[PDB]
Design a protein around this motif. Structure first.
Motif: not given
Ligand SMILES: [Mn+2]
Ligand SMILES: [Mn+2]
Ligand SMILES: [Mn+2]
Length: 280
Positions: A138-166
């Motif tokens: 799938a040349e231009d295939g898409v794997l779509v994902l929400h950012l998920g729960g805020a788990y109490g603090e959005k800044g740390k949630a987004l940091r884990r999200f990015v760090e665990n996917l990078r």
């Protein structure tokens, strides 16, 4: 006919009674029974591609259960060796039809979770999904994902999200991020997407419910440049009087016209409605 806006629907086709989302109970997860469900799902994938080529749908989201429990520690065989030839053939058909394929893992796939076992299971599911797209070519295939729960603090949630996917090379080839109705608006998703170097999927209904400071037009103008290929956008209408963000059977003319008027240029529109291929 041939429009600069291409249309899709997700997972199953109501007209055909075809679905890519057959599954089973874990107690029944034998090689035999899984192979049977997978074969039905793959047969229905083909039926759907052919339907789509005849009825002017260029996009299709494949159900997570295409290969049931593929990412589960108890999956009974090497699904990639089993299906690689078949997926190459189906993928070649989809390309020959000029169809774009995607996948949208569910609410339980949470790479920003602080719970290591949730992260591991979530990455397993993303790797399965990305591998499927690779096997389909799938040349231009898409794997779509929400950012998920805020788990109490959005800044740390987004940091884990990015760090665990990078470090997830193959996942990042397809990954695109989507705003939601409660937690993460378009402006917030753009920041996450910039960090990972991936595109942003604007969902019109989620945007309407959680716009931040942006009109739709500006959301789409900002999201457009994040795509190398054609942008993908989600179009849904509110299921009247249900939970905010629930999808109506059919998208309203007004929501479709609002989107058409707001689009800065050609794009692929995934119609998210309970009516599936009858959803617009
Ligand atoms: Mn979504
Ligand atoms: Mn959506
Ligand atoms: Mn939604």
């Amino acid at each position: 006919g041939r429009h600069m806006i291409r249309l899709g629907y997700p997972c199953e086709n109501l007209t055909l009674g075809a679905t890519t989302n057959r599954t089973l109970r874990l107690a029944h997860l034998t090689e035999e029974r899984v192979r049977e469900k997978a074969a039905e799902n793959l047969r229905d994938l083909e039926r759907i591609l052919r339907f789509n080529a005849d009825h002017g749908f260029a996009l299709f989201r494949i159900g997570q259960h295409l290969i049931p429990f593929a990412s589960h520690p108890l999956f009974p065989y090497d699904w990639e060796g089993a299906y690689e030839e078949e997926l190459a053939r189906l993928g070649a058909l989809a390309r020959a039809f000029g169809q774009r394929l995607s996948m949208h893992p569910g609410q339980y796939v949470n790479p920003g979770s602080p719970d290591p076992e949730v992260v591991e299971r979530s990455l397993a599911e993303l790797r399965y999904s990305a591998r499927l797209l690779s096997l389909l070519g799938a040349e231009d295939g898409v794997l779509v994902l929400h950012l998920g729960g805020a788990y109490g603090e959005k800044g740390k949630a987004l940091r884990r999200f990015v760090e665990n996917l990078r470090g997830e090379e193959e996942v990042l080839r397809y990954l695109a991020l989507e705003n939601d109705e409660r937690l993460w608006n378009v402006e917030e998703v753009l920041k996450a997407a910039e960090a990972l170097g991936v595109p942003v999927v604007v969902d019109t209904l989620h945007h309407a419910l959680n716009p931040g400071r942006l009109p739709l037009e500006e959301a789409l103008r900002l999201a457009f440049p994040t795509w190398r290929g054609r942008p993908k956008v989600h179009l849904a209408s509110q299921d009247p009087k249900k939970r905010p963000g629930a999808h109506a059977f059919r998208v309203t003319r007004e929501d479709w016209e609002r989107l058409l008027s707001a689009l800065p240029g050609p794009a692929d529109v995934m119609v998210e409605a309970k009516g599936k291929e009858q959803g617009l």
